[model samples]
Target: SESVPVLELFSNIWGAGTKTAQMWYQQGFRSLEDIRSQASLTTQQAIGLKHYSDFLERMPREEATEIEQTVQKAAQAFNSGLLCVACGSYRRGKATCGDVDVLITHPDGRSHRGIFSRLLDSLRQEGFLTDDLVSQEENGQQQKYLGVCRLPGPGRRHRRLDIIVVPYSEFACALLYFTGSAHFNRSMRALAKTKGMSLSEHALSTAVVRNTHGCKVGPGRVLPTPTEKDVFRLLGLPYREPAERDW
Candidate 1:
C-alpha cells in the first residue's frame, strides 16, 4: 500500500511498467529527474518524462471537446465521411478526463486504411500533436497512437491522448469497448461468457465452444455488428446509453 503512489507515478511513463518501477526503486531512484539522469530509457519513456506533469494533469471537458473537434476536422479534411468520436469518460459526460480517447474510421471502410498516418501527420503539422508514445501501433486491422497533444492557445495544457483507427465494420465493437467503464465491460464479458460467446475490443464472436477445462476448443464466428444496438442485441443485453454505461 505504501508503494502504490510511487509505483503509479513511475508507471505513467509510456514504456515503464510496475516491474520497471520496482527495479528503479531497488536501484535507489526516487525522482523523475533521477530516472531521467540515471536510467536508460526508451524513446517513449523519454517523451513521457519530458511532459510528465502535463500528462498527469486532467483536462476540462471543454478542452477535450475541442481536441475531439480538431481531430475530426483534420480527419474529415482528408475524407469527408470520416467518423471520429471521443470515447472513455468523455463520452460518459464526465466533467473532466485524464486523457482524451478519439476513435476514427471511415464510412466507406477501405478509406480508413491509410487515413491513420495522414491524420496524425496533419495534426502534427498543425502543431496539435506534440509527441508520440506508441506511434503507428498495429493490431490486426486497427492502428493506435498514444501520445501527448495540446489545444492551440496560450493557456492550453498538454494532455495525454489516444487515437484508434479501426475498420468501419468493427466500429460498433471498438466504440463500445473504448466508451466503457471497466465495471461495465466486466459485467458485459461475464454476460457474454454465460451465453457461450466472447466479446473483445475487436469483435463479438458467437457459438464459441469450450472444452471441459474451460479452454476454448473452437474459435467462434464473428458476428455482424453495424451499430451499438447490434452489439447489445447480440449479447442479449438491453441497449445502454453512453451516460448509463458508466456503471
Candidate 2:
C-alpha cells in the first residue's frame, strides 16, 4: 500500500468524495477522529478505514498539465492526427482535481486501434504512472485505460487518472461522458432512459425501454454526435458550462 496522504485518505471514506476531503483538510483535521465524534461522517462512512492519511492530496494543476502533455506526446507517436484532451473534473475548471480523465481519438479512427499499450508504456517509462486499475480493449468501437500517475517532484501525491480512446465517429459522445460530474451523468442517463434511449461514453442509442425494475427492456440504437452539444441537442437539454456541471 503506497502511503495515503491525509487528504487522499479522507477522500476514500465511503461517503466522502474529493470535495469533502478538501473540506476536512481545510478544517485542520489531521488524525482520524472516531466515526461518532466525526459528526461530518455518515454511519456508513464511519464503518471502515478511518485512518487513510496518504491518498487524498491530488496532483496539482501544473502536474496535471504535464500529464496531459505526456499523453499528447504518446498520441503523436501513434498518429500525428490523433487528438487527446483532459476532461472530467479538470475540464469542469475545479480549483483542484482528485484525478485526471482524458479522452483520445484520431481523425482516422482505426489508427487508435492498438495504441493503448504503446502509449501506456511511454508514460510508465517516464516514471509517471504508478498503478494500473483496468485495461479494456476491443469495445468493438473504442479503447480505454484507467490508472494512477505521480509527478516527478519530491513529496508529490499520487493521483487517479482515466484515459479513453474512441473512434472519431463517437468523439462527441465520448467527450460528454468524460467531462461529467456524477450528478450530471445521472440526470442525462435518466433523461435518455425516459426518452427510450441509452447514453454512454461510446454511443447514444435510441429505442431503449426499461421495465419497472429499471432494467433495459430494449436496446437503443446510437445517434450521430460529432460534438458535445449535439448530444444535448438530441436530449433536448440546454447546453451547460462545464464549470456549472456540479449539479
Candidate 3:
C-alpha cells in the first residue's frame, strides 16, 4: 500500500506506463535517478528522461513558428512546390502550443514520396531534429514522424514535433482534421454523420450506407476537396476561418 503513490509517480514517465512502472517499483526503483541508474530503458524512455522537464513545458507561438519554418525550409530543399503547413494549436492561432503538427503534401500529386525520409535526414544532420520517438509510420501514401526538435541557439529547449505527409488528394481533409479545437472537430464530425455523410482526416464521403443499428457499412465514394473550405461546404457548413474555429 505504501508503494501506491510511488507507482503512480513512476507511471507518469512518458514512455513507461502503468505496467512498466509497476515492474520498476517491484524491482526496487524508488526515484527517477534510481530508475535511470538501475533500470534498463528503451530508446523512448531514455529520451523521455533526458528531456523530462522540457517536454512538460509548452512553447510560445513564436518559437513554434520557428520550428515550423525549420521543417518547411528542409521540405523546400527537397522540392520547391511542396506544401508544408503547421496545424493543430498553431494553426488555431493559440498563444502557446504544446507540440508542432506539420502537415505536408505535393500539389502536383506525386512529389510526396521519398520526401518524408529525405527531409528528416536533412534536419537530423543539421542537429535540428534532436531525438526520434517514432521515425517512420507508413500508412498507404501517408507518412508520419514523431520526434523532438530544438532551434539553433543558446537557451533553446527541445519541443515535441509531429510531421505527416499525405497525398495531395487528402491534403484538405488532413489539414481540417489537424487544425482543430477538440470541441470544434468533434461537433463537425457528428454533424456530418447526421447529414448521412462521414468526415475524417482521410476524406469526406457522401451516400454512406448504414445498417439498421446506425452502423456504417461499405466505403462510400470520396468527395474531393482541394481546399479546407470545401469540406465545410460539402457538409452544409459555412466555411469557418481557422481562427474562428478556436471555440
* Candidate whose lDDT is highest: 3
Instruction: Kindly report which residue stretches of model 1 are placed more than 4 angstroms away from their true locations once superposed.
Output: 1-5
TM-score between model 2 and native: 0.75
Ranked candidates, highest TM-score first: 1, 3, 2
Candidate 2: 10-residue stretch with minimal lDDT: 46-55
- lDDT score of residue 185 within candidate 1: 92
Q: Give lDDT tens digits, candidate 2, residues 1-247.
A: 2324876666666467777767776766765663236547654355423323434565567777777887888779868888998988788888777778888888786787777778899889989876676677767677678776766779766666788888899888888888888899889988988888999877898888788898997777768888888888899999887887876
Model 3 alpha-carbon miss at residue 4, Å = 8.0
Off by over 4 Å in 2: 1-54, 211-214
For residues 59-175, what per-residue lDDT tens digits would candidate 1 score against the true structure?
889989999999999999988888899999999999999889999988888889888888899999999999888866548988899888988879888888999999998999999
- lDDT score for candidate 1 against the true structure: 0.89
Query: lDDT by residue for model 3 over 9-61, one digit each (tens)?
Result: 77766798989989998898898889889999999998888888888899999
Clashing pairs in 1: none
Comparison by lDDT, 1 against 3, better one = 3
Measured against the true structure, the TM-scores of the candidates, in listed sequence, are 0.92, 0.75, 0.88
The clash tally of candidate 2 reads: 16
* Backbone clashes under 3 angstroms, per model: 0, 16, 0
> Model 3: which ten-residue window has the lowest total lDDT?
134-143
